[PDB]
Design an enzyme around this catalytic site. Structure first.
Site, short mmCIF file in Angstrom:
data_model
loop_
_atom_site.label_atom_id
_atom_site.label_comp_id
_atom_site.label_asym_id
_atom_site.label_seq_id
_atom_site.Cartn_x
_atom_site.Cartn_y
_atom_site.Cartn_z
N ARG A 1 22.84 30.90 20.61
CA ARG A 1 21.85 31.90 21.38
C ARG A 1 21.90 33.34 21.72
NH1 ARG A 1 19.71 26.69 24.96
NH2 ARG A 1 21.03 25.19 23.80
N1 LIG Z 1 10.83 31.09 16.15
C1 LIG Z 1 12.05 30.96 16.44
N2 LIG Z 1 12.86 31.15 15.37
C2 LIG Z 1 14.14 31.03 15.07
N3 LIG Z 1 14.92 30.30 16.01
C3 LIG Z 1 14.27 29.91 16.98
C4 LIG Z 1 12.93 30.09 17.14
N4 LIG Z 1 12.38 29.21 18.26
C5 LIG Z 1 13.56 28.84 18.63
N5 LIG Z 1 14.64 28.91 17.92
C6 LIG Z 1 15.83 28.34 18.21
O1 LIG Z 1 15.75 27.56 19.37
C7 LIG Z 1 17.18 27.70 19.88
C8 LIG Z 1 17.38 26.77 21.20
O2 LIG Z 1 16.98 28.07 22.13
P1 LIG Z 1 16.20 27.74 23.54
O3 LIG Z 1 14.71 27.76 23.06
O4 LIG Z 1 16.67 28.69 24.56
O5 LIG Z 1 16.46 26.23 24.14
P2 LIG Z 1 15.98 25.40 25.23
O6 LIG Z 1 15.16 24.63 24.76
O7 LIG Z 1 17.02 24.72 25.98
O8 LIG Z 1 15.48 26.51 25.89
C9 LIG Z 1 17.62 29.13 19.64
O9 LIG Z 1 19.07 29.06 19.63
C10 LIG Z 1 16.88 29.63 18.48
O10 LIG Z 1 17.65 29.92 17.43
MG LIG Z 2 15.94 26.85 27.71
#
Ligand SMILES: Nc1ncnc2c1ncn2[C@@H]1O[C@H](COP(=O)(O)OP(=O)(O)O)[C@@H](O)[C@H]1O
Ligand SMILES: [Mg+2]
Ligand SMILES: Nc1ncnc2c1ncn2[C@@H]1O[C@H](COP(=O)(O)OP(=O)(O)OP(=O)(O)O)[C@@H](O)[C@H]1O
Ligand SMILES: Nc1ncnc2c1ncn2[C@@H]1O[C@H](COP(=O)(O)OP(=O)(O)O)[C@@H](O)[C@H]1O
Ligand SMILES: [Mg+2]
Lengths: 173, 460, 513, 52, 52, 458, 64
Positions: free
Chosen positions: C376
């Site tokens: 991340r």
């Molecule tokens: N639009 C996007 N493009 C690429 N990767 C995405 C996108 N949206 C989410 N991700 C992926 O979602 C993963 C989870 O991140 P995050 O949203 O912080 O998790 P959580 O749901 O716990 O917040 C990230 O490492 C990222 O690669």
């Molecule tokens: Mg989160």
């Protein structure tokens, strides 16, 4: 163990005994009640499920050293709650609350051998400064400890013994 | 002089009350006169007020309240040493066979600490069982744990007897068999199958079976283990058989419920992993000796995720699964070469030639397993010629994994063979490198080394 | 020569001289109960929660509950020999652990006691085991890279100093291998390393220590060990001791790396300790605070700005920024990435490397499963050259791996999907790597160069290995300066792109591999 | 190999220091029990009460 | 090198037999500030000198 | 004037004189070593005892300490002065700047606005995200919730919504971080401060390292700051980073408060604890709050009591799923579970509504075939049902979009897609006018034009 | 062993006189407050389902 369930009753009995300046009578009344609990036949009766108000009455019958209202009443309340077995501890916490109120302490002194009775005097004089209380001494003799002295004041101890020094040095290494 | 008094009795849980300064320590043993015979109680907990909670190593019926209890100042102690070979004992180390006293001189407590970090062997050897299938496809580490996931009617008992024989003869080690929680019938017929093959003088038997209170089924494994440890301290390489570790888990679950502790993962005790660990962490290879262990494992509900198998597999190094099929074809031992596994199969530990020979035979057999289905549906000659050679070599390899045991002479008549590892590697490299294609598959069956397969083909 | 008896005697003499004989007043209590490792102490009117209580022997117990009339405590060691009535002494110390750089190269118990035979510790005082991580204003965004030895994770899943990266998978898929290969790679990059083993077999720990010694890394690592036989209160408290030992470097402006061998077994030991206290359990019988358990642990692996390092160290250290990088390892049953604890830790860390068993059985090792493993902190933690050559390589392999699912039977568009498949296949054949074989950012970089700028279509799946071996030997022979340059910097430019293209065609044509 | 040579040097040094340490305190104990009397007891008790 | 370390160990142990009797007295005098005579202890110090 | 009598984990029991016992939710104070610890009472046990929750590290507390009764509830700085600064649950400034020059402080426990005062708004809000504003459009002044497991995109989606609506929005904004990473809080604080929008955002942060009480009351501490701007006549944006931690903190403490457990170990008062918060985060006639709430679902079980009881409190619900994110399809919104109160022919027009319902129908029909496709292969499907599958897959890919906040991951530049521009693309894909184009033409493109353009390069 | 609202001053009142005044059958005193449940001491003539009137204008339902 009734250490916790006895606190309310000991506190109430002591606060009542103070209002009427009968602390000594209350303490002796409790010391008799706590002995009625230890008799072989009465300890059988306290366990079997009798209705609280008949158990309380058969308990009151075996005691005529309880003042008409207030000791009998304490026994009736504890019997209603089913806690007559707690009396031996109500007594201890009553003695403790009394010692606190009259600002007294009783400290143990453990030695390899009896003290000089000038040493004892200095020890009492020093502790009466460590503690605000007038302090009794009950010196005791143990020979595992081999020199110096242990002063135990409730849950506070001063490990003056040389045995303590040896065990405390061995673990430095 | 006795000092305690029984105060509660509830099923197998007994509470006794001692003077306030004489409270026994945990795991200390106590005894009482349960009528005309003594009964041993093991302490499990210390409640307040001089009361201590125990579990009876025997039937608790007949116990009054107020019976006097004598406080033995030590845990359960059993006899150990050479004197126990060929005898049968129960959890308390009492001769349960009728041949009289055990003539030991020394007695050890069954509760002990695992070898410290700097006692463990600073090397990693291998144990030459002498069986071709195991030494090739699932090698044993010296001082490791081996699970045996076979079922019934496949020869588990004769495999165990062959391991006992070989590890007594071709090494100088003894063996210990702990009968945790299994049928009495199998125990009696195992005792006999061993007495009539002369291996009984090489094994020490301790039996706590399904008809025993929970405490016996719980501590019998520790009895067996603490005899194996005495044999280790003499410098030997020892082998310890456990009749079912799953029942050692379940006896602890029963006991934990008896003590009223809160349940945990899927009905098990909360201390499942620690109870398993304090056992499995005492059978290791020490600088003086080593205890190897072969443990029969039963997987509940056919689930390899259930907490008990999942907790056990954390400790197993090898794994040999017996198969009804491989027996049906007539190949004995009945090990399945595709499901048997070992985490010793790595070039960095076993070498590159052994590793790649084992992987070779594995790939050959796992292709044959489906060429044979293609044959079953489409008929033989539908195959390709390359595949026909694969089948013709796979059948030979599959035959060569058989072996005659010194214990099986009474069935096969052929004399038993002990095959060194080098010879198995040679035989299988040859069969897989295209050598010996000129002699028939029945020249390999039940033979031994390949240098005997050639001689069997000579006379065929 | 160095068994200087005079040295031993002077040591002991200094100790006897550096003694204190004056008595001291302490507070006392009595054990009332003993069961399954939990203790009930009556007295200790002056105990404080979290304190260390000292028992007969030299063992300790931690106070968890201050009930009205009793203290609840767990024994940190063998409890069987305790007995009702024994006295205990209340030390005025909250749970503390020796800390310092003198612990490097030692193998240590969770209480800091050395279990190797090499005698007492040299340590810079003590640190509290339970502490609260630096606040939001004290952090700094993770910038610098942490190089493992593996092309797969250094290319697809970069780790930066200060990141927390879960290594998750099933049993026997190479987790411990992947972790100690990251420990070994810091042998020369100035990052102290810490490896804590919770609930492991003693044989495995001895073997891992012997390997850490075999590659010279042990002189740079602290090993905190609580084996499968130890109390549930040592297993549960170990990773906090390890983090307390790492925060020593973090707070002084240095860099550290800490590995929790199984935060799945810490959860199990905490579940034991919690159920023995009759605490209502939740899902899968885990307690309510099983998330908080890992949260307050992993939230310490942080990177802190220079002002925090100044204020903490009373101004002794100017301008530097410290960091503690964590690689917790989790074990999942049957590859089930959607249980309770696995999901909690996925929700606490900054990414996950998911090691799949189907790949591991197929000879693909490290069996990194692209499409489920992410970092991340993304590319911010990569060197400029690696960030460039890598790009969307990981989602490219994920696409290839899923396409293989349908192309298993048949496919159309069947030249572009054909070249797609061949490229992805050769790339997976290139990403697998042997154990204990780390390769610098220079080698990974030029191999990824060869991977991306064509240069590999002709060479067969059978030769990928040979291509790499030759390539690296050739470049070690001839262009030692260019390697010395790319290893010293992020090192990306059209100049360096041209140098690499030249080396690529030279090796490709004149060398025959 | 050199690493293990050095580690075994360290380990033997520690092994020896341990025995020296335990015997030092056992000797001190026996000397003390062999040498205490009314004078030393009185001295210790007086010196601790003087700071009690 | 290990078989060299063993000889080193015996060599140093025979010397430390002389230091045990020093450290025991130093400890006994540190724990009780009343000085002690070697004379009355010359015998029991010898068991320590002997058993190391 | 009171003594401590028990210290169990995070809860503390304090004994007071019978005539001075504090009231519920009043705040007490102790000295924990050098530091000062604030307790908040939860219960009035009998006999002068009162049971409290410590807003700080509970370690170091002895029995018998002396605690002081502050005679007012927890009170936080509020209003304009708290703007662009970070604060504790207790309202203390957590950035290293000076005091918060507040003119007023508000108790964090307040009654929800009366039913008479509520207001309803059909005014659609537009976001740059295709799937969200096709399947689940939401309106100014309404609640939005992103449901998903661990690591599926429900924080990245919230940062994209912040980007798309919060910078283009006049009124102030409030961001409450409830039990999430401190790293993300630092990153967000610095991203804001580097674009000079920080002076429009108020931040509250009780991240995952802090003991249960901070995570328990930080959400209320944020809602108070939001309620203030609402009542001032303004219109506000309220982003809550993870509301699940607000109930997880309640579950951690419940058993210690002596309360029989419930369905899956949850506190017996789960639904009331959740309602008493989410009923005061609403718009009213005197102002409006627009709120986006991330909602973690444990173990990906959308039937666990905590998400199940939260579903009822949101107008537009967006449900992310791991089975889509594992396909590389980001955002991973699950179109067959996302919904909105605002998806009605009247509110969004007949064309938008019909396109959304057609997409749902197609994707569901594709779900129904997924098992026969699994067993018997795709070649057994009728020619009519092989077209349905190909259009379903094209639609699956066209819902993917690149985000400006995800350039760090994919490198591709983000895209902002207007609603008018997306309902047209989906009408086209469904009607078949793009039924000659390879699927991968639709993966990660902004508008249909970009897809027909990407098809030229394959 | 745990208490049942046997607390110091109530016990002291009972020591004063066991057969306490019975006039207050119609009223009682709150002894506990938590999560919306209150324990009342007294109210000897409360009936199950009855409405109990609290200070202010509020009511409670006697269930236990
Ligand atoms: N639009 C996007 N493009 C690429 N990767 C995405 C996108 N949206 C989410 N991700 C992926 O979602 C993963 C989870 O991140 P995050 O949203 O912080 O998790 P959580 O749901 O716990 O917040 C990230 O490492 C990222 O690669
Ligand atoms: Mg989160
Ligand atoms: N890159 C690799 N190439 C070849 N073999 C490997 C590789 N990585 C790991 N292995 C093999 O896998 C075996 C098991 O790996 P490892 O023990 O690291 O997994 P693990 O998950 O730690 O196992 P456990 O969960 O039981 O601790 C090792 O013996 C090693 O030989
Ligand atoms: N090595 C062998 N040689 C010949 N026969 C064998 C061999 N191993 C097993 N068998 C046969 O397999 C059968 C299984 O018997 P047994 O071992 O009693 O069952 P189980 O192993 O399930 O207890 C035996 O009757 C025996 O004849
Ligand atoms: Mg491992």
């Amino acid at each position: 163990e009734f250490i916790t369930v006895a606190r309310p009753y000991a506190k109430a009995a002591f606060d009542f005994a103070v209002e009427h300046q009968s602390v000594e009578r209350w303490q002796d009344m409790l010391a008799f009640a706590a002995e009625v609990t230890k008799n072989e036949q009465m300890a059988e009766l306290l366990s079997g499920a009798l209705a609280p108000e008949t158990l309380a009455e058969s308990f009151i019958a075996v005691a005529g050293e309880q003042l008409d209202e207030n000791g009998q009443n304490l026994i009736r309340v504890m019997a209603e709650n089913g806690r007559l077995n707690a009396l031996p501890d109500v007594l201890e916490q009553f003695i403790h609350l009394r010692a606190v109120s009259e600002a007294t302490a009783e400290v143990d002194v453990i030695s390899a051998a009896a003290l000089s009775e000038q040493q004892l005097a200095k020890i009492s004089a020093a502790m009466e400064k460590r503690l605000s209380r007038k302090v009794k001494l009950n010196a005791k003799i143990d020979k595992s400890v081999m020199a110096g002295v242990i002063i135990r004041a409730g849950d506070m101890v001063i490990d003056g013994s040389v045995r303590g020094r040896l065990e405390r040095l061995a673990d430095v290494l | 002089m006795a000092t305690g008094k029984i105060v509660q009795v509830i099923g197998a849980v007994v509470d006794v009350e001692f003077p306030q300064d004489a409270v026994p320590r945990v795991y200390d043993a106590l005894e009482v006169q349960n009528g005309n015979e003594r009964l041993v109680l093991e302490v499990q907990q210390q409640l307040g007020g001089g009361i201590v909670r125990t579990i009876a190593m025997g039937s608790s019926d007949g116990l009054r309240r107020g019976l006097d209890v004598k406080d033995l100042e030590h845990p359960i102690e059993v006899p150990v040493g050479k004197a126990t070979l060929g005898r049968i004992m129960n959890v308390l180390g009492e001769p349960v066979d009728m041949k009289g006293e055990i003539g030991e001189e020394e007695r050890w407590a069954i509760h002990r600490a695992a070898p410290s970090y700097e006692e463990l062997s600073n090397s990693q050897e291998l144990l030459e069982t002498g069986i071709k299938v195991i030494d090739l496809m699932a090698p044993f580490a010296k001082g490791g744990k081996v699970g045996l996931f076979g079922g019934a009617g496949v020869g588990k008992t004769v495999n165990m007897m062959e391991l006992i024989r070989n590890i007594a003869i071709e090494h100088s080690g003894y063996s210990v068999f702990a009968g945790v929680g299994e049928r009495t019938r199998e125990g009696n017929d195992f005792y006999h199958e061993m007495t009539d093959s002369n291996v009984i003088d090489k094994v020490s038997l301790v039996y706590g079976q399904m008809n025993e209170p929970p405490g016996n089924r719980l501590r019998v494994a520790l009895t067996g283990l603490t005899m194996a440890e005495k044999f280790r301290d003499e410098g030997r390489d020892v082998l310890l058989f456990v009749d079912n570790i799953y029942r050692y888990t379940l006896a602890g679950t029963e006991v934990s419920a008896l003590l009223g502790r809160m349940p945990s993962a899927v009905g098990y005790q909360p201390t499942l992993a620690e109870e398993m660990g304090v056992l499995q962490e005492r059978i290791t290879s020490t600088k003086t000796g080593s205890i190897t262990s072969v443990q029969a494992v039963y997987v509940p509900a056919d689930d390899l995720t259930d907490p008990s198998p999942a907790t056990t597999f954390a400790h197993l190094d090898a794994t040999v699964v017996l198969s009804r099929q491989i027996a049906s074809l007539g190949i004995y031992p009945a090990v399945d070469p595709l499901d048997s596994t070992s985490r010793q199969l790595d070039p960095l530990v076993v070498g590159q030639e052994h590793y790649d020979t084992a992987r070779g035979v594995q790939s050959i057999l796992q292709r044959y397993q489906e060429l044979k289905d293609i044959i079953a549906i489409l008929g033989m000659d539908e195959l390709s010629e390359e595949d026909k050679l694969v089948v013709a070599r796979a059948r030979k390899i599959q035959r060569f994994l058989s072996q005659p045991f010194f214990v099986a002479e009474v069935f096969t008549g052929s004399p038993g063979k002990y095959v060194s590892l080098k010879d198995t590697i040679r035989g299988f490299k040859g069969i897989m490198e295209g050598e010996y294609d000129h002699l028939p598959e029945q020249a390999f069956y039940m033979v031994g080394s390949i240098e005997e397969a050639v001689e069997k083909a000579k006379k065929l | 020569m160095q068994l200087n008896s005079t040295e031993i005697s002077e040591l002991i003499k200094q100790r006897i001289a550096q003694f204190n004989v004056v008595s001291e007043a302490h507070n006392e209590g009595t054990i009332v109960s003993v069961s399954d490792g939990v203790i009930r102490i009556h007295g200790l009117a002056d105990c404080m929660q979290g304190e260390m209580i000292s028992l007969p022997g030299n063992r300790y117990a931690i106070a968890l509950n201050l009930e009205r009339d009793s203290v609840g405590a767990v024994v940190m060691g063998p409890y069987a020999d305790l007995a009702e009535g024994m006295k205990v002494k209340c030390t005025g110390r909250i749970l503390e652990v020796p800390v310092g750089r003198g612990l490097l190269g030692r193998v240590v118990n969770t209480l800091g006691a050395p279990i190797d035979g090499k005698g007492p510790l040299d340590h810079d005082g003590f640190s509290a085991v339970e502490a609260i991580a630096p606040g939001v204003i004290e952090r700094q965004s993770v910038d610098q890279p942490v190089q493992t030895g593996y092309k797969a994770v250094d290319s697809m899943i970069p780790i930066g100093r200060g990141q927390r990266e879960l290594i998750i998978g099933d049993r026997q898929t190479g987790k411990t291998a992947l972790a100690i290969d990251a420990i070994i790679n810091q042998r020369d990059s100035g990052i102290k390393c810490i490896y804590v083993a919770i609930g492991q077999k003693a044989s495995t720990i001895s073997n891992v220590v012997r390997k850490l010694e075999e590659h010279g890394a042990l002189a740079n690592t602290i090993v905190v060990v609580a084996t499968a036989s130890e109390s549930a209160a040592l297993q549960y408290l170990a990773p906090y001791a390890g983090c307390a030992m790492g925060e020593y470097f973090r707070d002084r402006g240095e860099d550290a790396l800490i590995i929790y061998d199984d935060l799945s077994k810490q959860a199990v030991a905490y579940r034991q300790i919690s159920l023995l206290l009759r605490r209502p359990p939740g899902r899968e019988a885990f307690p309510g605070d099983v998330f908080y358990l890992h949260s307050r642990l992993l939230e310490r692996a942080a990177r802190v700005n220079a002002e925090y390092v100044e204020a903490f160290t009373k101004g002794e250290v100017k301008g530097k920024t410290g960091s503690l990088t964590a690689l917790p390892i989790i074990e999942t049953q049957a590859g089930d990435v959607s249980a309770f604890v696995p999901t909690n830790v996925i929700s606490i860390t900054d990414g996950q490397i998911f090691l799949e068993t189907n790949l591991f059985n197929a000879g693909i090792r490290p069996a990194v499963n692209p499409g489920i493993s992410v970092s991340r902190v993304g590319g911010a933690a990569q060197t400029k050259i690696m960030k460039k050559l890598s790009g969307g390589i990981r989602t490219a392999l994920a696409q290839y791996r899923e396409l293989a699912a349908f192309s298993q039977f048949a496919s159309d568009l069947d030249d572009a999907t054909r070249k797609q498949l061949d490229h992805g296949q050769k790339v997976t054949e290139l990403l697998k790597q042997k154990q204990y074989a780390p390769m610098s950012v220079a080698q990974q970089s030029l191999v990824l160069f060869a991977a991306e700028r064509g240069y590999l279509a002709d060479v067969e799946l059978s030769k990928i290995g040979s291509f790499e071996a030759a390539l690296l030997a050739y470049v070690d022979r001839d262009h030692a300066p260019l390697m010395q340059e790319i290893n010293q910097t992020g090192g990306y430019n059209d100049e360096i792109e041209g140098k690499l293209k030249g080396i690529l065609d030279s090796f490709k044509a004149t060398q025959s591999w | 190999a050199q690493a293990e040579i050095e580690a075994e040097r360290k380990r033997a040094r520690e092994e020896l220091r341990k025995q020296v340490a335990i015997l030092a305190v056992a000797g001190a104990e026996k000397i003390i029990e062999r040498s205490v009397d009314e004078a030393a007891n009185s001295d210790i008790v007086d010196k601790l009460v003087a700071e009690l």
